[PDB]
Amino acid sequence: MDVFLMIRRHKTTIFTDAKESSTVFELKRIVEGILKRPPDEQRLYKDDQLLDDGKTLGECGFTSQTARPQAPATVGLAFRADDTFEALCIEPFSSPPELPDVMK
Amino acid sequence: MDVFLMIRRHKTTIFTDAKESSTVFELKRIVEGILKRPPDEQRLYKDDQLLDDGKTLGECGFTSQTARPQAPATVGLAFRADDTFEALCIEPFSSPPELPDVMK
Amino acid sequence: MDVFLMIRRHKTTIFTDAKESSTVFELKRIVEGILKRPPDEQRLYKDDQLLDDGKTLGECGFTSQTARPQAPATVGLAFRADDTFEALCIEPFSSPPELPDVMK
Amino acid sequence: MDVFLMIRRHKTTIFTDAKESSTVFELKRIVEGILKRPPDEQRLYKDDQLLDDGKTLGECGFTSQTARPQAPATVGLAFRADDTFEALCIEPFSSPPELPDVMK
Amino acid sequence: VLRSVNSREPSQVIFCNRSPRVVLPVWLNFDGEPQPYPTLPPGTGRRIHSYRGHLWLFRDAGTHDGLLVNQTELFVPSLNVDGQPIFANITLPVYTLKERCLQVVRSLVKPENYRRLDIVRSLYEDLEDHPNVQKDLERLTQE
Amino acid sequence: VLRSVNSREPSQVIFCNRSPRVVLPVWLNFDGEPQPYPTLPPGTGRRIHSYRGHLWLFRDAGTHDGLLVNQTELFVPSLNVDGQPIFANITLPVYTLKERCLQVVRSLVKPENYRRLDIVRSLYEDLEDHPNVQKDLERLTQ
Amino acid sequence: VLRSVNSREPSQVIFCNRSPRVVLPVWLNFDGEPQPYPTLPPGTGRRIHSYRGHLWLFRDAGTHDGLLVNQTELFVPSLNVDGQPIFANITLPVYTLKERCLQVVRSLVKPENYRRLDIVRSLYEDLEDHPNVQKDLERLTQE
Amino acid sequence: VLRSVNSREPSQVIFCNRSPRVVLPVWLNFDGEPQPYPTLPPGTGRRIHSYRGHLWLFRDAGTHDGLLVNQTELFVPSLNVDGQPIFANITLPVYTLKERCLQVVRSLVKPENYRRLDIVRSLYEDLEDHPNVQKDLERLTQE
Amino acid sequence: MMYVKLISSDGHEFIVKREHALTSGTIKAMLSTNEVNFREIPSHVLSKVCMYFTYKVRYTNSSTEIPEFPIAPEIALELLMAANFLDC
Amino acid sequence: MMYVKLISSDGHEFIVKREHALTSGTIKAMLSETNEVNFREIPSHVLSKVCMYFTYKVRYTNSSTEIPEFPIAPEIALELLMAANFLDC
Amino acid sequence: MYVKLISSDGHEFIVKREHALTSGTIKAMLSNEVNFREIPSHVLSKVCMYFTYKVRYTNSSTEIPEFPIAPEIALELLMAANFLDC
Amino acid sequence: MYVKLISSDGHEFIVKREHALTSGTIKAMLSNEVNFREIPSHVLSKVCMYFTYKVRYTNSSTEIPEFPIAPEIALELLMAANFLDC
Ligand SMILES: COc1cc(-c2scnc2C)c(F)cc1[C@H](C)NC(=O)[C@@H]1C[C@@H](O)CN1C(=O)[C@@H](NC(=O)C1(F)CC1)C(C)(C)C
Numbered sequence A, B, C, D: 001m002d003v004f005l006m007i008r009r010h011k012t013t014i015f016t017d018a019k020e021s022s023t024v025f026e027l028k029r030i031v032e033g034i035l036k037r038p039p040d041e042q043r044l045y046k047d048d049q050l051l052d053d054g055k056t057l058g059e060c061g062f063t064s065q066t067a068r069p070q071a072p073a074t075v076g077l078a079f080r081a082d083d084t085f086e087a088l089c090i091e092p093f094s095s096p097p098e099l100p101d102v103m104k
Numbered sequence E, G, H: 001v002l003r004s005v006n007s008r009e010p011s012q013v014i015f016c017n018r019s020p021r022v023v024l025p026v027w028l029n030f031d032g033e034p035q036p037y038p039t040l041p042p043g044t045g046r047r048i049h050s051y052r053g054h055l056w057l058f059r060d061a062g063t064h065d066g067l068l069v070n071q072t073e074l075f076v077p078s079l080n081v082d083g084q085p086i087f088a089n090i091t092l093p094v095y096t097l098k099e100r101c102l103q104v105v106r107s108l109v110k111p112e113n114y115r116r117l118d119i120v121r122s123l124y125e126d127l128e129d130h131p132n133v134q135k136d137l138e139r140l141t142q143e
Numbered sequence F: 001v002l003r004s005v006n007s008r009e010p011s012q013v014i015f016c017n018r019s020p021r022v023v024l025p026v027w028l029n030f031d032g033e034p035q036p037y038p039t040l041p042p043g044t045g046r047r048i049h050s051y052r053g054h055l056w057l058f059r060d061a062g063t064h065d066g067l068l069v070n071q072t073e074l075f076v077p078s079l080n081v082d083g084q085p086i087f088a089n090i091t092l093p094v095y096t097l098k099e100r101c102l103q104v105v106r107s108l109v110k111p112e113n114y115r116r117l118d119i120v121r122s123l124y125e126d127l128e129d130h131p132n133v134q135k136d137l138e139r140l141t142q
Numbered sequence I: 001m002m003y004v005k006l007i008s009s010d011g012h013e014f015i016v017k018r019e020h021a022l023t024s025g026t027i028k029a030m031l032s033t034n035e036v037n038f039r040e041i042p043s044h045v046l047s048k049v050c051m052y053f054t055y056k057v058r059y060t061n062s063s064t065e066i067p068e069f070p071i072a073p074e075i076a077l078e079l080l081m082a083a084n085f086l087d088c
Numbered sequence J: 001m002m003y004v005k006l007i008s009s010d011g012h013e014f015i016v017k018r019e020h021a022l023t024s025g026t027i028k029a030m031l032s033e034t035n036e037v038n039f040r041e042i043p044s045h046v047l048s049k050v051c052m053y054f055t056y057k058v059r060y061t062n063s064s065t066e067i068p069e070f071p072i073a074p075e076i077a078l079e080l081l082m083a084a085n086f087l088d089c
Numbered sequence K, L: 001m002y003v004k005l006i007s008s009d010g011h012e013f014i015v016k017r018e019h020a021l022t023s024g025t026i027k028a029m030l031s032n033e034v035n036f037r038e039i040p041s042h043v044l045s046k047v048c049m050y051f052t053y054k055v056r057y058t059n060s061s062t063e064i065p066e067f068p069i070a071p072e073i074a075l076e077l078l079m080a081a082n083f084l085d086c
C-alpha cells in the first residue's frame, strides 16, 4: 500500500512516500508544503503523461513494488509561471566514470 | 552468434565483433562511437556490394566460420564528404619481403 | 592549444603566443599593447591574405603544429597613417655566409 | 648420533656439534680451532668431573637426546696459563625479570 | 565460550531462507568450533533435525557476510511443543551503507587488485577485512 | 578455488600425529569451506576414510597454530595401492622464533591484557592477530 | 619425482585429439622416465587401456610442442564409475604469439640454417631451444 | 660508486624511445663499467628483461649525446607492481643552445678540419670535446 | 513534516524528510540549519544516499523480508568513498 | 566499448577494443595515460596480425571448446616473430 | 612586459622580458632595449625562437622535439649562443 | 668459519657463521664480531639455540620437537626475535 517516490523538477528532487489509495492532489499538497506552490499551479507527470488530481497513485501505476524505498518511482513536476505552465524538464544526475580496469 | 570483422577505410582498420543476428545499422553505430560520424554519413560494403542497414550480418554473408577471431572478415567503409559520398578506398597493408631461401 | 607567432612589419618582429581559439582581433589587441597602435589602424596578414578580425587563428591556418615555439608562424602587420593603410612591407633578415668548404 | 654442545669458560660460550662416537680429545681439537689453545692446555669438564681424552662423548653422558639442538649440553672448559690450570669458572647468564602482572 | 550443549534432546527446525543470498548454516560444536552445513538457495526452506541447546549462526555462503535469524545473530533450538517444528527465519540485516558498499566492491574486484583502486588507503584495509566467523566469535567472547 | 573434488573414490588414510599438540583435522568441503573433524591427541594415529582429491589441513586444536602434513600445508589423499592406506604424517613446522614467541605469550596472557604489555605497538597487533584458518587459506590462494 | 604408481588397477581412457596436430601420448613410467606411445592423427579418438594413478602428458608428435589435456598439463586416469571410460580431451593451448612464431619458423627452417636468418641473435637461441619433455619435467620438479 | 647491485631479482622494462635519435642503452655493470646494449630506432619501444637495482643511462648511438629517461639521467628498474613492466621514457633533453650548436657543427665537420673553421680558439676546444660517457659518469658521481 | 535539503557537488538539491535524514548521526550533527552542502559527493551518489535513508527507516526492526539494497557497479567506488567519509 | 589506436610503421591505424589490447602487459604499460601508440618498427602486414592475436587470445583463453590454430603465413613469420620478441607477447 | 632586442643590421625583435631573461648575459645588459652590434638578424631571430622553445619545453613530460639549426647559420649561432650563455 | 655475538652483559657466544646468517639483521651487521647492546645473555643464548634448532630440523622428515621457551624470558625473546627477523 505504501509507495516511495522521487518528485523531480530541474535540479530539485523530493523524496517522499504516500499510499496507493492516495490521490494525485494529496501529493500536490505535499509539494506545496515543501516548495510553497499551490496545487493549481503545479502539474505532476508519470513519464510524459499528466496525472489528474482525482485519480489515485495506484491507478496511475505507482505500486508498492515499483515504488520501493530502495528504488523509488519518479514523478515529474512542472510549475506555472504567471500565465502559462513551464514544460516538464528533469536535469539528469551526474554520470559515473567508466568502470576501472580491475572491475571489468 | 559471434562474428569477427575488420571495418576498413583508407588507412583505418577497426577490429570489432558482433552477432550473426546483429544488423548492419548496429555495426554503423560502432563506427560512430569510434570515428564520430553518423550512420547516415556511412556506407558499409562487402566487396563492392553496398549493405542494407536492415539486413543481419549473417544474411550479408558474415558467419561464424568466415568471420573468425584469428581471421576476421573485411567490411569496407566510405564516408560522406559534404554533398557526396566518397568512393570506397581501402589502402592495402604493406607487403612482406620475398621468402628467404632457407625458408622456401 | 597554444600557437606561437612572429608578428612582422618592416624591421619589427614581435614574438608572442596566443590560443588557437583566439581571434585575429584579439591578436590586434596584443599588438596594441606593445606598439601602442589601435586595432582600427592595424591590418594583419597571412602571406598576402588579409585576415578578418572575427576569424580564429586556427581557422586562419595557425595550428599547434604549424606555429611552433622553435619555429613560429609569421603574421604580417601593416599600419594605417591617418587616411590610408600602407602596403604590407616586411624587411627580410640578413643573409648567412656561404657554407665553408669544411661543411659542404 | 649427533650431540649438540655449549662449551663454556668464564663469559665465553661455543655452540658446536659432535658425535657420540667422537672423543673428548676430538672435542678439544674443535676448541683449538676456535679458541687457538692446544689440547694440552685444555681440560674439559661435565659439571665438576674432568673428562679423559680417550673417552667418547656418549660415555661421558653426552647423548643425542640430552644434548639437543634446542637444549644443548654444557661442557666446562678451563685453560692452562704456563704451569698450572685455572679453576673451572663459568660465569652465569643474566637473570630474567619478574613475570609481569598480566602474564603471571 | 560459545559452544553447543550436548543435550541429546532432538529438536526439529525449519531453516527458512527469506533472503536473496545463498545461506550457509554454521553450527558451533561442543568444542566451540564453527562447523559448516549444507547450503540453502534463496527463498528455500528445509526441515532439519538438530538438538535442544545447540548454537547456530547463518552467513552468506559465498562471501561469509553475516545474516540474521529470528532478527538476532544466534539461534538456539527449543522444545517442540505439540510436534511443531521451530522456525528459524534467515533474513538480511539492514547493513550500514559502508558495509554494503564494501560487499559490492569485494564482489567486483579480486583481492589481489584492491590496492589498484583509486580510493583512500584506509579503504584498502577495509576491503581486505573480509567477514570472518572465527573473528566475530572472538568479539562476542569479549562481551 | 582450494576445495575438495567430489571424486566419490574412497581413499583410506592414516592420520599420524607426530607432534606434542592436540591436532584438529580440517577438511575443505566442495565449496571450499573448512570443516572441523574429530581431534587427535598427541602421538596418536588413526586410520580414517576419505576420498581421492579431497583437501585436508591440520591445526592445533586449542590455539589454531598451523601444522604440517608430510612436510607441507595441505594433504590430498591419493590411490591406495594394494589396499595400503596413505600415510599422513602430521608434524610441527619449524616456526620462526617470533611466531614461536607469540605462541608462548598468547598462552600466558589473555587477549584482554595484551595492550598492557610493554612492547612496540606492532607487537600488540602481532599478538592479537591470532592464527586463523580462513586468513591462511586466502594467503595461500593469493 | 613425477612418476606413475604401479596400482594394477585398470582404467579405460578415451584419448580424444581435439587439435589439428598429430598428438604423441607420453606416459611417465614408474621411474619417472617419459615413454612415448602410438600417435593420434588430428581429430581422431582411441579407447585405450591404462591404470589408476598413471601419469600422462601430450605433445605434438613432430615438434614436441606441449598440448593440453582436460585444460591442464597432466592427465591421471581414475576409477571408471558406471562403466564410463575416463575422457581425456587433448586440445591445443593458447600459445603466446612469440612461441607460436618460433613454431612456424622452426617448421620452415632446418636447424643448421637458423643462424642464416636475418633476425636478432637472441632469437637464434630461442629457435634452437626446441620444446623438450625431459627439460620441462625437471623444471616442474624444481617448482 | 655508481653501479648496478646484483640483486638477482628480475624486473621487466619498456624502453620507449620518444626521441628522434638512435638511442644506445648503456647498462652500468656491477663494477660501474658502461656496457652498451642493442640500439633502438627513433620512436620504438621494447620489452627487455633487467633486474631490480640495476643502473641504466641512454645516449645517442652515433654521437654519444646524453639523453634523459623519465626526465632524469639515470634509470633504475624497480619492482613490477601488479606485473606491469616499468616504463622508461627516453626523451631528448632541452639542450643549451651552445651544446645544440656544437652538435650540428660536429655532425657537419670532420674533427680533422675543426681548426679550419674561423672561430674563437675556446670554441675549438669546446667542439673537439666530444660527449663522453666516462667523463659524464665522473661528473655525476661527484654529485 | 519537516524536510531538509541535501545539495550535491554538482548542485542537485535533494529534499528529504527530517526524520528520515536523522538516521545518520553525521547528518544530525551536520544540521547542528535545514540545508547541507556536500561539495565532494556528486548527485549520482547523493541520490543513492537518500534511498538508503528511506530503506533504513522502512526496514529497521521489521520481521518482514528485507530486500537487498541495490548498488550499480558504476557507482560502487564513489558510494563507498562517500559512505566512508560520512560513516553511515 | 573503449577502443585504442595502434599505428604501424607505414602509418596504418588499427583500432582495437581496449580490453583486447590489455591482454598484452606491454601495451597496457605503453598506454600508461594515452589512447594511441605508434609502432615505428612494426609494418602494417605484421601489426594487423598482432591485432588478430588479441582477438584470438581474448576469445579462446580458458575455453573448453576446440581451439583452432593461430595461422601465420610463412612470408610474415620472421617479422611477426621479431615484433613478438620486441613486444614479448 | 616585453623587451626589445636590436640586431647588428637594425632588426628589432620584441620578446617577453621573462623569455629574454633566459640569458644571463641579457639579464646583465638590462640592469628596455638592447643592441647587439655583432649579432645579425638571421641569428638573433633564431635566438629568440630558442627562448620560446626553452620556456615551453623545460620540465615537460611531453615528447620534446629537436631544435632545428640550418647548417648555414650554425657557426654564427654558436658564437652568439656562447656570448649570451644560453 | 665462526662468528662472535656479544650480549648486553658482555657474554661472548661463538656460533657457526652459516648459522648466524639465518638472521638478515645479523647478516647486515656483518657486512666477524657483533655487539647487541639491548639483548642480555639469557636471551642471546636462547637465540643461538634457535639457530641450531632451525638448521637441524628444517626440511627434515623426523619428528620435530617443540622449541622450549621459558615464560620468564618470553617477552624479551619476542623483541629480540622481532629485531633480528628470524
Ligand atoms: C547432513 O544432515 C543434516 C543437514 C542439515 C542441513 S543444514 C542446511 N541444509 C541441510 C540439509 C542439517 F541442518 C542437519 C543435518 C543433520 C541430520 N543434523 C545434525 O547434524 C545436527 C545438527 C546440530 O544440532 C548438531 N547435529 C548432530 O546430529 C550432532 N549429534 C548430536 O547432537 C547427538 F547425537 C545428540 C548427541 C552431531 C552428530 C553433529 C555431533
Ligand SMILES: COc1cc(-c2scnc2C)c(F)cc1[C@H](C)NC(=O)[C@@H]1C[C@@H](O)CN1C(=O)[C@@H](NC(=O)C1(F)CC1)C(C)(C)C
Binding pocket: F006, F007, F008, F009, F015, F025, F027, F037, F038, F039, F040, F046, F047, F048, F049, F050, F051, F054
Ligand atoms: C566420523 O568419521 C570420521 C572420523 C575421522 C577422524 S578425524 C580424527 N580422528 C578420526 C577418527 C575422519 F578422518 C573421517 C571420518 C569419516 C568416516 N570420513 C569422512 O567424513 C570423509 C572425510 C572427507 O573426505 C569427506 N568425507 C565424506 O565422507 C564425505 N562424503 C563423500 O565425499 C562421498 F560420499 C563420496 C561422495 C561427506 C559425507 C563428509 C560429504
Ligand SMILES: COc1cc(-c2scnc2C)c(F)cc1[C@H](C)NC(=O)[C@@H]1C[C@@H](O)CN1C(=O)[C@@H](NC(=O)C1(F)CC1)C(C)(C)C
Binding pocket: G006, G007, G008, G009, G015, G025, G027, G037, G038, G039, G040, G046, G048, G049, G050, G051, G054
Ligand atoms: C600398445 O598398446 C597401447 C596403445 C595405446 C595408444 S596411445 C595412442 N594410441 C594408442 C593405440 C595406449 F594408450 C595403451 C596401450 C596399452 C594397451 N596400454 C599401456 O601400455 C598402459 C598404458 C600406461 O598406463 C602404462 N600401461 C601398461 O600396460 C603398464 N602395465 C601395468 O601398469 C600393469 F600391468 C598393471 C601393472 C606397462 C606394461 C607399460 C608396464
Ligand SMILES: COc1cc(-c2scnc2C)c(F)cc1[C@H](C)NC(=O)[C@@H]1C[C@@H](O)CN1C(=O)[C@@H](NC(=O)C1(F)CC1)C(C)(C)C
Binding pocket: G122, H006, H007, H008, H009, H015, H025, H027, H037, H038, H039, H040, H046, H047, H048, H049, H050, H051, H054
Ligand atoms: C639481448 O638481450 C637483451 C636485449 C636488450 C635490449 S636493449 C635495446 N633493445 C634490446 C632488445 C636488453 F635491454 C636486455 C637484454 C637481456 C635479456 N637483459 C640483460 O642483459 C640485463 C640487463 C641488465 O640488467 C643486466 N642484465 C643481465 O642479464 C645480467 N644478469 C644478471 O644480472 C643476473 F642473472 C641476475 C644475476 C648479465 C647477464 C648482464 C650479467
